[PDB]
């Protein structure tokens, strides 16, 4: 489950 990053 690949990380989801919003920066």
């Amino acid at each position, epitope marked *: *489950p690949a*990380p*989801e*990053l*919003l*920066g």
Partner: antibody, heavy 114, light 113 residues
Framework: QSVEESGGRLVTPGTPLTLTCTVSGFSLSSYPMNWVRQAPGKGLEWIGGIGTSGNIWYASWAKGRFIISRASSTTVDLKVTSPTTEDTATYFC??????????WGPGTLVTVSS | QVLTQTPSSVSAAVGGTVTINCQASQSVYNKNYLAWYQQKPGQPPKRLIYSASTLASGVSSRFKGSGSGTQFTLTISDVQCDDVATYYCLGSYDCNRAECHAFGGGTKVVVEV
């Protein structure tokens, strides 16, 4: 590359209000986009954002109070579903938030009062 | 995740040093996804530092970020009058596991002459 917020105004509590973030000089779908607010004299608070995935995320506290969407090829909106006096704040949008492409708008002021 | 900054206010001498602490209730992504922001009245926040210790392009080397996991520090050296501002830490996380972002509550910096 820049972003600019619009739609900030005086609204009576309970009246739906939509703010818009307009992007210039980049593709909205190629970067994360975020909404952040700041009540007068108070701290920055992350509301939510859109990943490059297209997934739309909210802060715990913002759930049920705000809806974010890709409104056009060049805009992301933030709808405040039922504003209260505690939603009085400047609302910022940003491309990113920590990476080197991060850029913020000047903010748009929402005043919730009768 | 909730981030707590201490102190909430600093009054420091020009040419001195200020230390601002940030504690995260849970470990940030990769142990280092913690950014620092500077904001002046009526202006958008300006990114100073990302990944705990990486200075953002255009920023003065007087700003230094340190720490890891849940405990982080911003140090402003050779404090200048134009450092008067509020400073915020920003913790970021895998959205699949935690709040994507959380800001600290801010630390106001004022200078003494």
């Amino acid at each position: 590359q820049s972003v600019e917020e619009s739609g900030g105004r005086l609204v009576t509590p309970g009246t739906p209000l939509t703010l818009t973030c307009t992007v210039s000089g980049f593709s909205l779908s190629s970067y994360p986009m975020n909404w952040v607010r700041q009540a007068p004299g108070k701290g920055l608070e992350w509301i939510g954002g859109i990943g490059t995935s297209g997934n739309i995320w909210y802060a715990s506290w913002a759930k049920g109070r705000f809806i974010i969407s890709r409104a056009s090829s060049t805009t992301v909106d933030l709808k405040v579903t039922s504003p209260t006096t505690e939603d009085t704040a400047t609302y910022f949008c940003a491309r990113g938030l920590y990476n080197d492409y991060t850029v913020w708008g000047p903010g748009t002021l929402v005043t919730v009062s009768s | 995740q909730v981030l707590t900054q201490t102190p909430s206010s600093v009054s420091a001498a020009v040419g001195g040093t200020v230390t601002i602490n940030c504690q995260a209730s849970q470990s940030v992504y990769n142990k280092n996804y913690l950014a620092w922001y500077q904001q002046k009245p009526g202006q958008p926040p300006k990114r100073l530092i990302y990944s705990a210790s990486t200075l953002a392009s255009g920023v003065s080397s007087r700003f230094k970020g340190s720490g890891s996991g849940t405990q982080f520090t911003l140090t402003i050296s050779d404090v200048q009058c134009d450092d008067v501002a509020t400073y915020y830490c920003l913790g970021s996380y895998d959205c699949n596991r935690a709040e994507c972002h959380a800001f600290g509550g801010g630390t106001k910096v004022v200078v003494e002459v």
